[PDB]
Amino acid sequence: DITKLQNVVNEYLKSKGLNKGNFENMFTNKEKFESQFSDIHRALLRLGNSIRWGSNVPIDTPYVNLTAEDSSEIENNLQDAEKNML
Amino acid sequence: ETVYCTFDHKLSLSDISTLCKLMNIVIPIPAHHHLIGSGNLGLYPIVSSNKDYVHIRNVLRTMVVTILQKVEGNQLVLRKPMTGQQYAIKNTGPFPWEKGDTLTLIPPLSTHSEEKLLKLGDWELTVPLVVPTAIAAEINIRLLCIGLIAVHREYNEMQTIIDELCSIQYRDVLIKLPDIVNDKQSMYSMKTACISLSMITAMAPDIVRTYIDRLTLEDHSMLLIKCQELLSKRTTLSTQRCGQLHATDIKDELKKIKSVLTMIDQINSLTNEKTYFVVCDVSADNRMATCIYKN
Amino acid sequence: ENWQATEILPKIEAPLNIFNDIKTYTAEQLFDNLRIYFGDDPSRYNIS
Amino acid sequence: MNSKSSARAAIVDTVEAVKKRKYISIEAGTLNNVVEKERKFLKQFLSGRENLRIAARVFTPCELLAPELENLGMLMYRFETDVDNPKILFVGLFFLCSNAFNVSACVRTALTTMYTNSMVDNVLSMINTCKYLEDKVSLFGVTSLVSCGSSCLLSCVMQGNVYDANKENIHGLTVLKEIFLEPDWEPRQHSTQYVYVVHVYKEVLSKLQYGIYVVLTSFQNEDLVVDILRQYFEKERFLFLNYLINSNTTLSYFGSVQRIGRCATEDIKSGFLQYRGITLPVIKLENIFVDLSEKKVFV
Amino acid sequence: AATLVRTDNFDVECLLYSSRAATSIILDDPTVTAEAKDIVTTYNFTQH
Amino acid sequence: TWIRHHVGIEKPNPSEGEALNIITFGGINKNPPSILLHGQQAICEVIL
């Protein structure tokens, strides 16, 4: 599902419109490559565009997403997974 | 090139005065021919006797526009218009002409309470309404909405929703579209037009699905992503029970695409509206206007 | 009635009537029976 | 053969054909009653079979026509208005290319500084409060004869070459150099090209912004030119595919193309306009046979 | 308090004097043009 | 609403949107008085 989302959404938006982030599309092609640690490095930089489209005149916002209780519940779920991977 | 029309019955003095009131008007003509009788003058030999509205819209596209020039002792002089030149058109329709507007022919809103400009022994004279192009599009869309919702039952607001469809307004001239509750005076019934629209909107998703589920390896890169988005937004729960569970024939897919493309090039009539006249100036009190002729 | 007549026929030349507001007489409609035209009209050429 | 003689014969034949179209022989009995002025007018007896261009007189409040009262030959736009007092109102191509988005910021502000007053500000507010653009304002023709009285009289050509009278100083369409572009593999292929006007919309996250483009191509066929313009505009077309569903504003397409008319390849020349010192680069088409076709939309 | 201002528009017949040969008119012989709309052809006489 | 009542105005505040630009682009106007016996009138005002 990471490959489906990252393929379908990210490359094709930045190709279909706003043809300046193709360097970042080469970065997300290397993110599609199995270099996950270095890939998830600069998820901030590829989050900033989502911040720009969620709210007009782009600012910096917290890294987890827009809804507050969903934002906290994501972190609760990540701590649950980190405690029990199985 | 001109055209003479000699009437078939006798005419009253009031009828000759009606023609002198109507001495400039568009008349459609089936045969591009020099001598035409009142048995084939006009559009009533086609509407009211043959399939109506969509073949009528195709026919009003394909007949010969011809304007009245002068009325003799009992004969009609009709000059047929040449492209690129000026002519003069009187204003019969309710909507006010303005300068630089494009003009088109819509079929008449055939309520049988009209004054029936001539009615000469079971023959009558029907003209198309010269109208601006924006209003023609709006009238076409309102008629398709009426013809769609007239088949539904058990809306308890059906009278007020048909009334809100029939009341349109354009530059302070109201008109009520006479296709009320299916009085059947001339509803025009548009049944292939609505059937054709809904065949398109029903056969579309599965045809684009069967095409898009194939050859994604090639780098199209735009079409594949767009169809997934467009299809799964509206039809969000896509193909659960599936009907037949993916047992299709290539011949079946052939027949699906061939049918869905026949429907489009046969609803070609309601597709476009050509600009028959581009009015350059309009006379005072909006009686008539000098235009130029195109298409 | 027979408007094409007075537009066509012989007309006896009349001395000035010295009447003001000819336009006003018409636009106020002193007369029950008048026909005017604001600009030139081919309505006298059809003879039936 | 003789050559010179036959050439003079052909020239006399063309001049006599011009006279046959211009004057009419009179078969009235033509008695000796009339004065000599009416005599010579009954011998000549002109008719208007000579100009063969189609014009229209137009009244517009003169606050809107800032460079166009000086520079003859401009596109003009009819803006219908819900005000009963003036039902239509006329608009310069530059006046609408102000809030077009294709124009860069320097040219946009420079032109705006030409176009800054209360009337023009109110009209731009009306145009922005209109939903779409293409069927609240519309193409009207090419400018000749600006009068500039109190309410300025504009003639405007629907069809034919652009000239007031005398068939002298045949004016040309003046297109802003930034807003036009020619999509074809070989620009200026062989001969006379057809000049079109393309309206393209765009949506920057809140509202629609229109763009006014002018294309010049050798293709006559409208299907071919919309097929080359989809290939040109395929990316923003994709962005509108996402916009036009979530929007509710009554429009159903990306843009529309409409033919202005013919040109000539050797009659394309560059230049610049200047009004109140603002140098402004233009591509001046020289001789234009104006021919308005229908609007053809593409989604 | 207030000062209510009010205008009023009248009708005046108003005579004029001008000394002789005060202002000259240089003018043209009137020219003729013709345009043919295909129902009526307008003949226009201009003079500068 | 109270002031529009007690000076005699009905249909208040013509729009926030289109009628703003319409009125600032053209005179708003009103229906003409049914009976008029003396001509034109308007009186302005200085507070003092």
Identify how the structure was determined: cryo-EM
Give the minimum alpha-carbon distance from A51 to chain D in angstroms, rounded to a whole number: 13
CA distances from F42 to E5, F8, F30 (A): 9, 17, 14
How far are the Cα atoms of B167, B176, B183, D285, E40 from residue B157, in angstroms, in the given order? 16, 18, 18, 58, 54
- Distance, in Å, from the CA atom of B108 to the CA atom of B177, rounded to the nearest integer, reads 10
Q: Cβ–Cβ of B229/D234 closer than 8 Å?
A: no
Interhelix angle D234-246/D222-232, nearest 10 degrees: 90
Q: With H, G, I as helix, E, B as strand and everything else as coil, classify residue B243.
A: coil
Token pair of E18, please? 């001008």
What whole-number distance in Å separates Cα of residue D257 and Cα of residue D253?
12
**DSSP state, B33?**
-
Task: Kindly determine whether residue A17 and residue D206, on different chains, have CB atoms separated by under 8 Å.
Answer: no
d(CA D78, CA B146): 32
Q: CB A13: neighbour CB atoms within 10 A?
A: 18
- How far is it, in rounded angstroms, from Cα A3 to Cα A31? 9
The torsion region of residue B144 among left (phi > 0), alpha (psi -120 to 50) and beta comes to alpha
Residue D285 to residue D263: CA distance in whole angstroms: 7
- Rg, C-alpha atoms of chain F: 14
Among the listed residues D84, D73, D203, D96, the one whose alpha carbon sits nearest the alpha carbon of residue D143: D73
- Residues constituting chain E: 48
Helix-, strand-, coil-residue percentages of chain B, each rounded to 5: 35, 20, 45
* Burial label, D105 (beta-carbon count in 10 A; 0-12, 13-18, 19+): exposed
Residue in D33, D152, D131 with CA at minimum distance from that of residue D89 = D152
In one letter, which amino acid is D7? A
CB contact under 8 A, B16 and C48: yes
- Interface partners of chain E (CB pairs < 8 Å, 3 or more) are B, C, D, F
D248 Cβ contact partners less than 8 Å away, ≥ 6 residues apart: none
How many whole angstroms from its chain centre is CA C19? 16
Concatenating the DSSP letter of every residue in D98-139 gives SS-SSS-HHHHHHHHHHS-SHHHHHHHHHHHHSS-STTTEEE
Please tell me the distance from the alpha carbon of residue E37 to that of residue D49, in angstroms, as a whole number. 9
Torsion sign (Cα): B36, C47, B21, B104 = positive
DSSP string, D93-106: HHHHHSS-SSS-HH
By residue count, chain C amounts to 48
Partner-chain residue, chosen from F43, F47, F48, that has the shortest CB–CB distance to E6 = F43
Using the Cβ of B87 and the Cβ atoms of chain E, whether some distance falls under 8 Å is answered with yes
Of F40, F42, F48, Cβ closest to residue E3: F48
Resolution for this experimental structure (Å): 9.0
Distance (Å, rounded) from C-alpha D26 to C-alpha D44?
Answer: 9
Helix, strand or coil, per DSSP, at residue D169 = coil
* Residue in chain A nearest B227 by alpha carbon: A8
> Do residue D83 and residue F24 have CB atoms under 8 angstroms apart?
no
Q: Name chain B contacts of E38, Cβ cutoff 8 Å.
A: 85-88, 290
F28, F37 contact by CB (below 8 A): no
* Minimum distance, in Å, between the CA of residue C47 and any CA atom of chain B: 6
CA–CA separation, E36 and D165 (whole Å): 14
Interacting residues of D119 by C-beta distance below 8 A, sequence separation 6+: D61, D63, D64, F25
Six-digit token string for D245: 């569903």
CA distances from D110 to D77, D272, D281, E16 (A): 21, 14, 12, 51
Question: Across the interface, do A12 and B228 touch by the CB < 8 Å criterion?
Answer: no
Shortest distance, CA E10 to any CA of chain F (angstroms) = 10
Task: Compute the distance between CA of residue A86 and CA of residue D64 in angstroms, rounded to an integer.
Answer: 73
Are B148 and B165 in contact, with CB atoms under 8 Å apart?
Answer: no
Query: For chain B, how big is the Rg over CA atoms in Å?
Result: 24
Question: Which residues does chain D have within 8 Å of residue A16's beta carbon, measured at their own beta carbons?
Answer: 235, 238-239
Q: Are D56 and D35 in contact (CB under 8 A)?
A: no
Pairing status of strand B2-6 against strand B35-37: parallel
- Give the span between the Cα atoms of E46 and F3, in whole angstroms: 59
Tally the C-alpha atoms within 13 A of residue B234's C-alpha that lie toward its C-beta: 11
CA gap C12, C7 in Å, rounded:
13
Instruction: State which amino acid sits at residue B93.
Output: G
| Distance (Å, whole) CA D282 – CA D5 | 46
3-state secondary structure of B201: helix
Phi then psi dihedrals of residue C23, to 5 deg: -60, -45
F31 DSSP assignment: P
Instruction: Give the closest of A17, A53, A56 to D238, CB-based.
Output: A17
Cα–Cα distance between E38 and A67 in angstroms, integer? 71
Can you read off the two tokens belonging to residue F8?
């005699």
The pairing of beta strand D208-217 with beta strand E41-46: unpaired
Give the end-to-end CA distance of chain E in Å, rounded to a whole number: 58
Neighbours of C, requiring at least 3 CB pairs below 8 Å, are B, E
Report chain E residues whose CB lies below 8 A from the CB of F38: none
**How far does E21 lie from chain F, in Å, by closest CA?**
41
Cα separation of D37 and D43, whole Å? 10
- Cα separation, E36 vs D47, in Å, equals 6
Please state, in angstroms and rounded to a whole number, the distance separating the CA atoms of residues B110 and B185: 8
Give the residue among B174, B213, B38 at the shortest CA–CA distance from B94: B174
Q: How far is CA A19 from the centre of its chain?
A: 19
> Is any Cβ of chain D less than 8 angstroms from the Cβ of F41?
no
Contact between D98 and D124 under an 8 Å Cβ cutoff? The reply is yes
Task: Compute CA A39 distance to the chain's CA centroid, rounded to the nearest angstrom.
Answer: 10
D82 interfaces chain F, CB cutoff of 8 Å: yes
Pairing, β D268-275 against β D278-285:
antiparallel
Mutate to test the interface with A, among D238, D243, D254 (most CBs of A within 10 A): D238
The phi and psi torsions of D136 (rounded to 5 degrees) equal -110, -30
- Measure the CA angle with vertex B73, ends B69 and B77; round to 5°: 25
In this complex, is the C-beta atom of B74 within 8 Å of any C-beta atom belonging to chain C?
A: yes
- Helices then strands, counting H and E runs in chain C, come out as 2, 0
What secondary structure letter does DSSP report for B149? H
In chain B, what residues touch C46 (CB-CB under 8 Å)?
20, 70-73
Using a CB-CB distance cutoff of 8 angstroms, which residues of chain B are in contact with residue E42?
Answer: none
Q: Is D177 exposed, middle or buried (0-12, 13-18, 19+ CB in 10 A)?
A: middle
All residues of chain E having their beta carbon less than 8 Å from the beta carbon of residue C41 are: none
Contacts of B235 (CB under 8 A, 6+ apart): B205
Task: Tell me which H or E stretch contains B129.
Answer: strand B129-132
Q: Tell me how far apart the alpha carbons of residues B281 and B100 are, in angstroms, rounded to a whole number.
A: 8
Which helix (H) or strand (E) segment holds residue E44: the answer is strand E41-46
Give the span between the Cα atoms of D65 and D115, in whole angstroms: 9
Of D111, D264, D85, the closest CA to residue D173 belongs to: D264
For helices D234-246 and B223-234, the axis angle rounded to 10 degrees is: 0
> What whole-number distance in Å separates Cα of residue B167 and Cα of residue A39?
61
Contact between D200 and D210 under an 8 Å Cβ cutoff? The reply is yes
Distance from CA of E3 to the nearest CA of F (A): 5
